[PDB]
Write a protein that binds this ligand. Structure first.
Ligand SMILES: CCCCCCCCCCCCCCCCCC(=O)OC[C@H](COP(=O)([O-])OCC(O)COP(=O)([O-])OC[C@@H](COC(=O)CCCCCCCCCCCCCCCCC)OC(=O)CCCCCCCCCCCCCCCCC)OC(=O)CCCCCCCCCCCCCCCCC
Ligand SMILES: CCCCCCCCCCCCCCCCCC(=O)OC[C@H](COP(=O)([O-])OCC(O)COP(=O)([O-])OC[C@@H](COC(=O)CCCCCCCCCCCCCCCCC)OC(=O)CCCCCCCCCCCCCCCCC)OC(=O)CCCCCCCCCCCCCCCCC
Ligand SMILES: CC(C)=CCC/C(C)=C/CC/C(C)=C\CC/C(C)=C/CC/C(C)=C/CC/C(C)=C/CC/C(C)=C/CC/C(C)=C/CC/C(C)=C/CC1=C(C)C(=O)c2ccccc2C1=O
Ligand SMILES: CC(C)=CCC/C(C)=C/CC/C(C)=C\CC/C(C)=C/CC/C(C)=C/CC/C(C)=C/CC/C(C)=C\CC/C(C)=C\CC/C(C)=C/CC1=C(C)C(=O)c2ccccc2C1=O
Ligand SMILES: CCCCCCCCCCCCCCCC(=O)O[C@H](COC(=O)CCCCCCC[C@@H](C)CCCCCCCCC)COP(=O)(O)O[C@H]1[C@H](O)[C@H](O)[C@H](O)[C@@H](O)[C@@H]1O
Ligand SMILES: CCCCCCCC/C=C\CCCCCCCC(=O)OC[C@H](COP(=O)(O)OCCN)OC(=O)CCCCCCCCCCCCCCC
Ligand code: HEC
Ligand code: HEC
Ligand code: HEM
Ligand code: HEM
Ligand SMILES: CCc1nc2ccc(Cl)cn2c1C(=O)NCc1ccc(N2CCC(c3ccc(OC(F)(F)F)cc3)CC2)cc1
Ligand code: FES
Lengths: 185, 218, 105, 139, 75, 524
């Protein structure tokens, strides 16, 4: 019974709504870039590209690791799932720490939220993505703790799958934000 | 170019006349006269943002030396107090800090702590009104605040509170708002209410959680 | 010190019509409820607020209480000036100061 | 499912058409060029409907006929055992209370209230997720 | 005292009855206490209207319960 | 240590009382540790107070500070305030110790209140134990006043205001005795010279001694009248089911003691309480905005705030307002210890009881308790008027009137809701007794009908429906996973699996031991 999965449909439609949320943020960003003529990233601000590439590659590797974990989950063994999801958690934590470090080193000598318009839109666009990543980390921890406390049933597999492609959606919207902010300018 | 308050009476006419009058006469519906007041009142009211009002503190509207413009324009129509200046002509910040904190703290506890706090946190007055926090105000704002006597705050002249007394009070306030808490995380600056809340919501839940873990339930 | 603008809303309790010197009034500072210092003075409502349990006295109406468990007015002190221009007391309180007891106020 | 996918494809086609038309009509004939705020919303609503429609399309191509999608069918076809539908639970009201605490702590700028609200939200969501998976007590 | 089991299932395991006269008299007394609190230093009358509005609802509820119990629609 | 043990045995020969105390059985419910919490808090209080007495000087003479804390140099203060400042700033580890002391006092009070709530709601005060209830009530009163006298010792502005207002000007207002009590206690008018030494003597010697004697008597009565228990599988009014002291109970008690000490140390190191240096020495002319006593006197303060100004003036005399606060507080303190006798007079039940009641089986008492707790919460929140009206933007007069009206309309509303809620819980229990436990699975029953696959708790009749059980005062399961339904995860560590033989053996022996425990406790 119930040949198409239900949790899958729910997660998919919710991810669509989240995409619309990020649409609102993008619309905020593109305006105030048309108004600032010339060096629209103001003089105290210049982005350090020597740090933003490794964190993006780390996030992509996280996506690969999560897909491997789902492959392991579809056949009923919990330990491969646990290993791959621990790896994914560690890589996401590294990404968040790198982003926070760049925030510190960038607020150190210039750009602030109340000090500019570019700084405002930049921090607003990237901090919400950071919050989404932190939520994904919490979901990973909860899923592992839930696999710890009973036998492996197909419901656990469905939960793993939906958490997986939530993570995929996250690290795709990150690619969009990165290509828009750091390269297009 | 001090003979130029044409700016000044260019911003007042487009941001104030609806509530104070074209001649600074106090529209009998909303605003006071603003004649006896001086540059210090305008400085404190505009720099903190309480001015032009729709009164809480907000974001200021005017700078780029136009607070000076409105202040000079209002001073030219009366004899109120003026803002302190340093040998450069700018507003003094560093020269308004005294060197004696004992006397300043005793004066603060006698005159100021009744409405604000022991250490300058807020306090509640009757029927709405409250006394705000003293953390984000700089030195000249403290001086002009206790010199001009804003809404429902008493007015401390330079004869009952001399200039040393004011400087020492400023120094005590700025030190009390910037000192560490050498006992751990202070729970807001108030007395036993945050302490009781933290007890009930941290220590008791830890104790009851460990009691639930150790002992069985039946 | 009361602003010269109002000076027409004063009510002047029955036995103390001449206890003020112009615009100076000099009430006591010990709340007539339980004895905390009633020091919170709002300058343009003319209200005195006791911070211990929040009573409110009306500085323009012989310090009559207008909110809270406070039930008796604050005591007023007579003042004047001396031959040199300093403020001095022109006598004593007409009644005991502070909280009440079995004998009298 | 074949009709849901077709519905979402219709919607995605119309939204993409409208987005492109608006973009190229405001590139010219407009005061300051491309409008940049309706354009974005339109492309990303197109993307929303596209994601949903593509998922439904894959699930339809990977599925055999279903008594719901199938006419000609009788009630003896669906005779079986449905999923698990949760009976009574009291965790939703606690989740809502925690989120409301965090929201009112964000309205009036009070950081301690925001921290307490976030902690309570984590606790209540953990309680909701684990409700039907805790085992018997170990003694 | 006594209550039938079909109203309170665990009527034999503990105290489960409170006589209705207690509740009626308590409601009337609380209304009277709310009313007598217009004696004080209240300058302003915004607070008196809440006192009068909350004392009318209590009396209304008590009267409704008494009248319905008197005509057998309850118990 | 055979030689030493035998020589102790020929000199004392206990060997039978030790066996009688090593075999005592104690019930194991998480709710039976709320008294241990208070006991351990009291022990920590004793230790830290004995440490503190080596540095405190309780005088009221005036000195000039001339210490290390610079923003107070040259200020004239009493000797007690200076001694407290010296403890805080000039003894290595003194601030930590006094913060532990204050946090332990707070935890003492909170644990006592939670324990009282348990005792009241489960009905553990009935026939054999009214006197133990009375002793507990006396302990509560003494703890309140001891904490008050304690935090009034290092006389600073806040403690001085509290002393002045409450003690001086409520004792001063009593109808006839009044000023006589005030002058006997203070030695004269309010700011004297004998107040702080007298409070010091009362606080370190007398009240701790009385509390220690009463705690000894309390624990003795609990030891010789064996503990109560909840109804269950093998529980009767004539036996105690639990674990023996010998290996287990002492171990659990000691581990709980260590964990409570750990929590107290952590929160005494990381959170700040009573920073007396931000205040100043007490002076009768200056005041601040907070005021506020510790959370176990806040109800007294709130009652004084929201009580209307009703005074009586007759011939040559005056009865002020705080007299009302006095009689109401006395009435509360008299109605607390005399409750079991009231309930036994009203319900007319005088039998021995050793099995507890679930709070849902006694709706009227549960509603009474919820009403009292709501009243207490209203009184406590009415004490932080200033903080509430400042942080949350509300008028001050508005909060006063909100408290003044809530004091009358919240208790009855809470009573009504609690009564209906208790009966609803009873009905929910009866439904799962009549039918089985809902599993949450749905079927379609080829003629298009939806059923929900209940699961019976006992025997079944001919046509598959379970025969209804009878209620026995014990809790019933509501979730299928609490019964063993979906369990048995893998037996790895966290990332690597174990062998299959190990997994099978461990699972199978665990199942066997569970079944044996069940079958053993049923049969007795
Ligand atoms: C001529 C014939 C006419 C034909 C008949 C026609 C019928 C109707 C037509 C009449 C026309 C009138 C129409 C006017 C509109 C009616 C208004 C109305 O709706 O009333 C509600 C009315 C109530 O229903 P009902 O028919 O009266 O129910 C029967 C009784 O409940 C049965 O229960 P009971 O009454 O027997 O129980 C008594 C109960 C009565 O309760 C009720 O029945 C309802 C009222 C309770 C509500 C709140 C509790 C009281 C708080 C007062 C302040 C509130 C603010 O009293 C209490 O228990 C309350 C607590 C008392 C506290 C006392 C403390 C005791 C401890 C002592 C210690 C000493 C300390 C001293 C200090 C303490 C101070 C006291 O009908 C409803 O709308 C609700 C029906 C069921 C609820 C469904 C969900 C409703 C959703 C809401 C939206
Ligand atoms: C204003 C608007 C009004 C709001 C309405 C009030 C909200 C109340 C929602 C929670 C209701 C809980 C409940 O009714 O459970 C029934 C519960 C037993 O249910 P049952 O179906 O018979 O199951 C028993 C069977 O033996 C079968 O038992 P079982 O083994 O199947 O499981 C039973 C359950 C044990 O059953 C319980 O007794 C649970 C007790 C939870 C108390 C609620 C906390 C408040 O097992 C547990 O031990 C799980 C809970 C472990 C500790 C609870 C963790 C609390 C997390 C808090 C995070 C959220 C922050 C709160 C909001 C933040 C800002 C406000 O009995 C009670 O009614 C407990 C009394 C709680 C009512 C007073 C609490 C609110 C008072 C005023 C609020 C303002
Ligand atoms: C006056 C009294 C008697 C009643 C007034 C209370 C009430 C009217 C206030 C809020 C009302 C509200 C907006 C109604 C709607 C909200 C409803 C839909 C659900 C949300 C309700 C929640 C958010 C209420 C919050 C609980 C709150 C009242 C308790 C506060 C506890 C104490 C007083 C706070 C003091 C306090 C504490 C406890 C700190 O830990 C702390 C830590 C660090 C810095 C400062 C502080 C601090 O000031
Ligand atoms: C059980 C009942 C009280 C017995 C009734 C017996 C009989 C009726 C005596 C008459 C007494 C009547 C007339 C007046 C009552 C008031 C008076 C007696 C006060 C004396 C003190 C004493 C009796 C205390 C009463 C019982 C006590 C309040 C138990 C409450 C605690 C229990 C039930 C639940 C606690 C669970 C806890 C771990 C989580 C709660 C989290 C927080 C929100 C608790 C709420 C909370 C509390 C409780 C604070 O005290 C507090 C103080 C300062 C700041 C904040 C808070 C605060 O948030
Ligand atoms: C009744 C007990 C109440 C507590 C005090 C004892 C009785 C009080 C009895 C009392 O009322 O007055 C007392 C009368 O003194 C006394 O006997 C001293 C106390 C001893 C009582 C009698 C001796 C016992 C045998 C005090 O009058 P006194 O402080 O001297 O003078 C006052 C003015 O201030 C004020 O103008 C006014 O004229 C009065 O207030 C006046 O009393
Ligand atoms: C709304 C959330 C918006 C954005 C979130 C992303 C945060 C982005 C983090 C980066 C911040 C930054 O780098 O800005 C440096 C500046 C220097 O300003 P300053 O004046 O010179 O310094 C003097 C400081 N007083 O500090 C700041 O504004 C402080 C930033 C405040 C932290 C962000 C607030 C998070 C609260 C979450 C809300 C949850 C509520 C849920 C209820 C529904
Ligand atoms: C009618 C809306 C309104 C506007 C617009 C407005 N004010 Fe005010 N102003 C008030 C009111 C009302 C007060 C009374 C002070 C109070 O109660 O807080 C006041 C007070 C003042 C005071 C202090 C009066 C005293 O006696 O100390 C000054 C100075 C002042 N305004 C200047 C200004 C300036 C500068 C502007 C900006 C051009 C401005 N006003 C615009 C309403 C307004
Ligand atoms: C309760 C009476 C009261 C007294 C006494 C009092 N204040 Fe105020 N204070 C207030 C009120 C009310 C305001 C708000 C005025 C406004 O917003 O226009 C205020 C505002 C201030 C501000 C502005 C705070 C800010 O962030 O802009 C400062 C600074 C200040 N007072 C300092 C002092 C000092 C120093 C003393 C002691 C000499 C003192 N106050 C005594 C009530 C008082
Ligand atoms: C038994 C219950 C007790 C309670 C509820 C209690 C409570 C308190 C409190 C709250 C303080 C304030 C501390 C501060 O603010 O710094 C205090 C001070 C003090 N306590 Fe206790 N205490 C208790 C027992 C004891 C005992 C048994 C002793 C000594 C044997 C003791 C010795 C002291 C001393 C000397 C002070 C003053 C030192 C100081 O204030 O720094 N206390 N007490
Ligand atoms: C300092 C104060 C108190 C301490 C140290 C204390 C401690 C204890 C302890 C350790 C127990 C046995 C273990 C347990 O029941 O969890 C107990 C039981 C009991 N307490 Fe308290 N308590 C105190 C206050 C009170 C109060 C305020 C009351 C009312 C009270 C009444 C009782 C009763 C009746 C029992 C017997 C419960 C039973 O046998 O099941 N005690 N107390
Ligand atoms: C209004 C309260 C209050 N406002 C503030 C404001 C600011 C601050 Cl910081 C603290 N507060 C507090 C405060 O500290 N509240 C705690 C408190 C309350 C009452 C009592 N009591 C002393 C003995 C009396 C007594 C003694 C003997 C008697 O003789 C007889 F009859 F034989 F018993 C009769 C009465 C009763 C009250 C102690 C502590
Ligand atoms: S002490 Fe001033 S109101 Fe009670």
């Amino acid at each position: 019974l119930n040949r198409p999965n239900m949790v899958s449909v729910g997660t998919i439609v919710w991810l669509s709504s989240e995409l619309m949320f990020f649409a609102g943020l993008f619309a905020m960003y593109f305006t105030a870039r048309a108004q600032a003529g010339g060096a629209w990233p103001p003089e105290p601000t210049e982005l350090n590209l020597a740090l933003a590439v490794p964190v993006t590659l780390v996030l992509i590797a996280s996506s690969f690791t999560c897909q491997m974990g789902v492959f392991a989950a579809e056949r009923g063994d919990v330990f491969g799932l646990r290993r791959w999801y621990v790896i994914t958690f560690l890589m996401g934590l590294f990404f968040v720490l790198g982003q926070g470090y760049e925030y510190i080193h960038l607020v150190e000598h210039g750009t602030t939220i109340p000090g500019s318009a570019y700084g405002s839109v930049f921090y607003l666009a990237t901090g919400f993505h950071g919050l989404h990543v932190i939520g994904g980390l919490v979901a990973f921890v909860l899923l592992l703790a839930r696999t710890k406390m009973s036998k492996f049933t197909p419901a656990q597999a469905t939960a793993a799958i939906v958490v997986s492609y939530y993570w995929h959606f996250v690290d795709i919207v990150w690619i969009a934000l990165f290509a828009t902010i750091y390269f297009v300018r | 170019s001090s003979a130029l308050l044409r700016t000044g009476k260019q911003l007042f006419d487009t941001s104030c006349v609806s509530c104070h009058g074209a001649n600074l006469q106090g529209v009998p519906d909303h605003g006071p006269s603003l004649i006896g007041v001086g540059e210090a009142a305008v400085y404190f009211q505009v720099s903190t943002g309480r001015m032009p009002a729709m009164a809480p503190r907000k974001d200021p509207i005017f700078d780029e030396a136009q607070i000076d413009a409105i202040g000079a324009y209002v001073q030219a129509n009366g004899g109120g107090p003026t803002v302190v200046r340093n040998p450069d002509g700018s507003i003094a910040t560093q020269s308004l800090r005294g060197n004696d904190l004992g006397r300043g703290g005793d004066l603060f506890r006698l005159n100021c702590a009744s409405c604000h706090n022991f250490t300058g946190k807020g306090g509640a007055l009757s029927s709405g009104k409250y006394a705000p926090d003293l953390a984000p105000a700089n030195e000249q704002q403290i001086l002009t605040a206790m010199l001009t006597g804003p809404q429902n705050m008493p007015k401390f002249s330079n004869r009952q509170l001399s200039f040393e007394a004011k400087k020492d009070i400023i120094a005590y306030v700025k030190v009390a708002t910037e000192a560490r808490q050498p006992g751990g995380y202070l729970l807001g600056g108030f007395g036993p209410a945050p302490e009781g809340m933290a007890m009930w919501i941290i220590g008791m839940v830890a104790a009851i959680g460990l009691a639930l873990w150790i002992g069985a339930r039946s | 010190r009361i602003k010269p603008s109002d000076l027409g809303r004063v009510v002047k309790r029955k036995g103390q019509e001449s206890f003020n010197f112009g615009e100076f009034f000099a009430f006591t500072k010990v709340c007539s409820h339980l004895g905390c210092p009633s020091s919170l003075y709002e300058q343009q409502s003319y209200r005195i607020l006791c911070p211990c349990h929040q009573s409110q006295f009306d500085a323009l109406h012989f310090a009559k209480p207008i909110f809270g468990p406070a039930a008796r007015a604050l005591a007023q002190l007579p003042i004047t000036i001396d031959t040199d221009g300093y403020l001095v007391a022109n006598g004593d309180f007409v009644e005991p100061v502070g909280p009440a007891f079995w004998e009298r106020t | 499912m074949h009709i849901e996918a077709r519905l979402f494809e219709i919607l995605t086609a119309f939204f993409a058409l409208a987005a492109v038309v608006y973009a190229v009509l405001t590139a010219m004939f407009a005061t300051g060029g491309v409008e940049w705020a309706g354009t974005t919303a339109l492309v990303l609503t197109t993307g929303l409907t596209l994601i949903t429609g593509t998922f439904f399309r894959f699930v339809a191509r990977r599925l055999d006929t279903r008594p719901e999608d199938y006419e000609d069918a009788e009630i003896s076809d669906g005779a079986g055992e449905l999923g698990f539908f949760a009976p009574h639970s009291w965790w939703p009201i606690l989740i809502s209370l925690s989120f409301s605490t965090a929201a009112v702590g964000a309205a009036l700028w009070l950081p301690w209230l925001i921290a307490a609200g976030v902690a309570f939200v984590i606790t209540s969501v953990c309680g909701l997720v684990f409700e039907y998976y805790w085992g018997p007590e170990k003694h | 005292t006594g209550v039938d089991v079909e109203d309170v299932p665990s009527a034999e395991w503990g105290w489960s009855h409170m006589p209705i006269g207690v509740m009626h008299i308590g409601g009337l007394l609380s209304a009277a206490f709310l009313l007598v609190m217009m004696r004080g230093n209240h300058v302003g009358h915004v607070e008196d209207w809440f006192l009068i509005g909350f004392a009318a609802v209590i009396v209304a509820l008590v009267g409704r319960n008494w009248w319905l119990r008197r005509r057998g629609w309850i118990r | 240590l055979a030689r030493q043990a035998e020589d102790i045995d020929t000199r004392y020969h206990p060997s039978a009382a030790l066996r009688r105390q090593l075999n005592k059985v104690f019930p194991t419910h998480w709710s039976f540790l709320l008294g241990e919490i208070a006991l351990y808090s009291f022990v920590v209080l004793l230790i830290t107070g004995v440490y503190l007495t080596l540095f405190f000087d309780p005088s009221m003479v005036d000195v000039t500070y001339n210490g290390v804390y610079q923003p107070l140099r040259g200020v004239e203060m009493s000797r007690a305030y200076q001694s407290a400042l010296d403890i805080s700033f000039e003894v290595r580890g003194g601030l930590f110790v006094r913060q532990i002391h204050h946090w332990a006092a707070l935890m003492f009070a909170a644990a006592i209140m939670v324990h009282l709530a348990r005792i009241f709601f489960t009905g553990a005060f009935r026939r054999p134990r009214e006197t133990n209830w009375v002793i507990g009530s006396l302990l509560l009163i003494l703890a309140m006043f001891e904490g008050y006298f304690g935090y009034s010792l290092p006389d600073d502005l806040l403690s001085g205001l509290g002393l002045r207002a409450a003690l001086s000007s409520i004792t001063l207002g009593m109808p006839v005795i009044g000023t006589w009590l005030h002058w006997a206690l203070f030695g004269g008018d309010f700011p004297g010279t004998i107040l702080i030494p007298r409070l010091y003597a009362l606080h370190i010697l007398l009240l701790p001694g009385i509390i220690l004697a009463l705690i000894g008597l309390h624990l003795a009565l609990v030891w010789f009248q064996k503990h109560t228990q909840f109804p269950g599988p093998g529980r009767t009014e004539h036996n105690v089911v639990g674990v023996r002291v010998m290996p287990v109970f002492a171990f659990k008690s000691g581990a709980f003691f260590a964990a409570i000490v750990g929590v107290l140390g952590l929160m005494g190191g990381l959170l700040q309480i009573n920073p007396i240096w931000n205040l100043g020495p007490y002076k009768p002319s200056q005041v601040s905005a907070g005021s506020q006593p510790d959370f176990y006197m806040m109800w007294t303060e709130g009652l004084a705030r929201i009580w209307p100004p009703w005074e009586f003036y007759f011939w040559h005399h005056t009865i002020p307002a705080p007299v009302w606060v006095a009689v109401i507080m006395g009435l509360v303190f008299v109605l607390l210890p005399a409750y079991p006798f009231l309930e036994k007079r009203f319900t007319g039940d005088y039998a021995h009881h050793n099995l507890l009641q679930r709070p849902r089986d006694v709706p009227v008492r549960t509603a009474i308790g919820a009403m009292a707790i709501a009243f207490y919460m209203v009184l406590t929140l009415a004490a932080m008027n200033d903080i509430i009206a400042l942080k949350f933007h509300i008028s001050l007069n508005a909060t006063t009137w909100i408290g003044r009206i809530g004091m009358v309309i919240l208790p009855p509303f809470v009573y009504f809701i609690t009564y209906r809620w208790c009966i609803g819980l009873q009905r929910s229990d009866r439904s799962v007794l009549e039918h089985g436990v809902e599993t949450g699975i749905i079927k379609r029953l080829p003629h298009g009908a939806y059923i929900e696959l209940h699961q019976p708790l006992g025997p079944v009749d001919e046509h598959g429906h379970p025969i209804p059980l009878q209620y026995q005062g014990a809790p019933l399961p509501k979730r299928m996973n609490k019964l063993g339904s979906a369990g048995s995860p893998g037996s790895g560590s966290f990332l690597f699996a174990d062998s299959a033989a190990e997994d099978a053996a461990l699972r199978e022996a665990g199942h066997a031991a569970e079944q044996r425990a069940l079958a053993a406790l049923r049969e007795h």
